[PDB]
Design a protein around this ligand. Sequence first.
Ligand SMILES: Nc1ncnc2c1ncn2[C@@H]1O[C@H](COP(=O)(O)OP(=O)(O)O)[C@@H](O)[C@H]1O
Ligand SMILES: O=S(=O)(O)C[C@H](O)CN1CCN(CCO)CC1
Ligand SMILES: OC[C@H]1O[C@H](O)[C@H](O)[C@@H](O)[C@@H]1O
Length: 477
Amino acid sequence: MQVLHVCSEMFPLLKTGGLADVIGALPAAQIADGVDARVLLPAFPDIRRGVTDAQVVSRRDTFAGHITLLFGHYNGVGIYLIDAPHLYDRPGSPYHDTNLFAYTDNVLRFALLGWVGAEMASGLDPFWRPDVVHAHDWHAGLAPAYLAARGRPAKSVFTVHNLAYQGMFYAHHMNDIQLPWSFFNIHGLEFNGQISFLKAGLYYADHITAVSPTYAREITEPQFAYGMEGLLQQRHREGRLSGVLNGVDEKIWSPETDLLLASRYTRDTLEDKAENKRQLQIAMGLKVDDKVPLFAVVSRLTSQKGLDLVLEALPGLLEQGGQLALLGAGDPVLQEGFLAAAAEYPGQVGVQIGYHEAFSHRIMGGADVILVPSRFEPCGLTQLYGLKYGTLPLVRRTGGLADTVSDCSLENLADGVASGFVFEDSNAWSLLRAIRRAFVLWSRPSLWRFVQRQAMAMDFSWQVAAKSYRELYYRLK
Ligand SMILES: Nc1ncnc2c1ncn2[C@@H]1O[C@H](COP(=O)(O)OP(=O)(O)O)[C@@H](O)[C@H]1O
Ligand SMILES: O=S(=O)(O)C[C@H](O)CN1CCN(CCO)CC1
Ligand SMILES: OC[C@H]1O[C@H](O)[C@H](O)[C@@H](O)[C@@H]1O
């Protein structure tokens, strides 16, 4: 069984969010579980420099110009790179320029990603050919389309990590991407009078996967599908939609071995976490105080994440005696709002705007609560990281958060199953109730400790996830 993942990022080489974490860990899990998994990525500078043993497999001409297909290894997994410097050798973000504008040739940059994914099924590499092309998110959405147009020389799975990113391009670009014009149809890749790469992935794949069981159910609803629900309802009825929960990479997210921490610790030695908290407070400019709960955010700052609710809830949180440490980058309204909060409440609110990989570990390892009040959340990896680090997740019951966190209710505490704090509605009052719940449990230190140890007993394993994908791949044949 040979599988090629087609995607635009991979931890630790290039990361803008959880997708990178997935691609960095799943393939090695699949190999352990008996599937020859390989990865296809554009040769962005950071990726190209990480894969030091990469060799030439072939040169091709393409609707988007020439590629050199490279193959090397990273952390033992086979990595193909699309070297096309005219498309991919640009600084910063893979998706947009310095001014945060999408590249004007994005249609070509990502149509090419899908195209190479599909070519691989036809022998682009004379030495290896995937049985299944596994495409991730809109960026790779054309791969099942090129496969369909070639008579499906391999099976395809499409996994949605986030349905809110649709890969919308003007219809005239059908001219530029070498797909049958007949594909521009509602029974095809057309969506609201434009090309959608997301629609393409959803429509042409043999099977669609979402990144949690409940997100898979949610995307059949208008509220979470944004127009795509009709397609998704049909694919569900056909038995072509399913949810496979993400795992966590233990090599990197384990307080037991985390080299980025002031102090390592375990489920049975949580007293060793205290030093991380002290150093976090010092680093953030917070009052150094072990009697007070430290709430935390590590997050992209977009409306998905419900962090406007945190801004609203903040006075209530501070009034009860809590602290907030935030790390994040995104909407300037959010950035400025949180910066204003830190200025207004020095020693109670610490804020760091930007992307800081190492600093997220020090927050995860020092904080008491991780706020994930998402409006929607396909999976959420930060709350899984919180569980593992005994930093109790406070979450909205939506998507993967609904699948992974158990509220501190009477039954859950009595059944020994409670692991965090759950609220229902996307408003600050509903959030503030879960926050109050946290303060109440905080006032009972041995119950807090009991919930911490249950959080740390939760297991999110890539090799277990691998087993589900494997069933899928064999089912498709
Ligand atoms: N500002 C940041 N600095 C460092 N890491 C971040 C930052 N924002 C998000 N992350 C990381 O990116 C990943 C986010 O994944 P996830 O919670 O699945 O949400 P999303 O993929 O929607 O961003 C986590 O590993 C998280 O720690
Ligand atoms: O905004 S774009 O559509 O131009 C590019 C991406 O969709 C932005 N991302 C990166 C991939 N994503 C998953 C990150 O884990 C969603 C946000
Ligand atoms: O699948 C990895 C990640 O994909 C997307 O970025 C989602 O926004 C996030 O919830 C998920 O954890």
